[PDB]
Amino acid sequence: EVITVRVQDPRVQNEGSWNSYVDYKIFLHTNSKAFTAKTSCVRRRYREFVWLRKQLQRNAGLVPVPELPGKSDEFIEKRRQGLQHFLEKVLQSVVLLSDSQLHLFLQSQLSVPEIEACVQGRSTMTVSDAILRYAMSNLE
Amino acid sequence: VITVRVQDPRVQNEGSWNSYVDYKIFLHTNSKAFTAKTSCVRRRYREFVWLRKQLQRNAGLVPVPELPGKSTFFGTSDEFIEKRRQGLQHFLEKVLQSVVLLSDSQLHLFLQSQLSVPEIEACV
User: Fold this and answer.
1) Per the database record, which ranges form the PX domain (chain B)?
2) Partners of residue B15 in chain A, C-beta under 8 Å
3) Strands of chain A, DSSP E
4) Topology of domain B2-123, per CATH?
C-alpha cells in the first residue's frame, strides 16, 4: 500500500478584510485500504493543523507526534514545506495513521467542530455488553 | 456516481438513562468536475424511522424501501448492531436508486446536514 500527500497552492481567503487568512490545499493520493478516497483535495488553515496535532497527541498516548513549523510569499512557502513534511511524517507512524480525526481532516471538507461531532461516545465494541444493551433500548 | 456507507456504531451518553446508539452515514459522491465530495453525519435509528415516513409522504405512490425491524434474531448484542448497520446501509442504497426519493430535500438534509429532525422540519 502507498500513500502520497502534498500541500500545494497557498491562497488568501477574504483579501484585505480583518478575517483575512491563508489556507493550503492538501492533495492526498493513496491506493491503501486504510483510506477511502483514492484521490482527495481539501483546503486547511494553519490553525486547523494546530488543532489536528493536539488531537493526534491525545489518541497517540505515548507515540511521538511530528512538529509543525512555528513563526510574505517566502514565509508561506517555508510553512507550506513544513506542513507537507509534518503530514509525510504523520503518515509513516502507523498508530497516527489509524486516527479517525486525521482521516476526516485529510479527506472530508468537514469543519473542525464537524469532525469533533462525527467522533463522539465510545464505539459499540469498546463498551460492556451491559452499557450497549442499556443504550439499545432508548425512547422519545 | 453516489456511494453511501453506514459505519462506526457508537453509544452516545454511556451508562446514563438517555444512553443511545447512533450510526455514521458516509455519503461519498463525485462530479468529474471536482475530485471527491464526502459528507459525514451521525443518525439514531429513530431518525431513519422518521426519514422513511417523510419519504412516503412526498413520494405519493412510489414504493419506499423497508427498514430492518427486530425479527427472529438469536445473536449477541454486537451482532444485532452489525445486522441493523447493514440493514440501514441497504435501505439508503435502495433509496438512492429511486430517482424520485433521491430528489427529496428532507433526505438531502438527513444525509448531508448535521441538523436535528425538528431543524429539518423547520428548514422546509
Assistant:
1) 1-117
2) 131, 134
3) 3-13, 21-30, 39-45
4) PX Domain (3.30.1520)
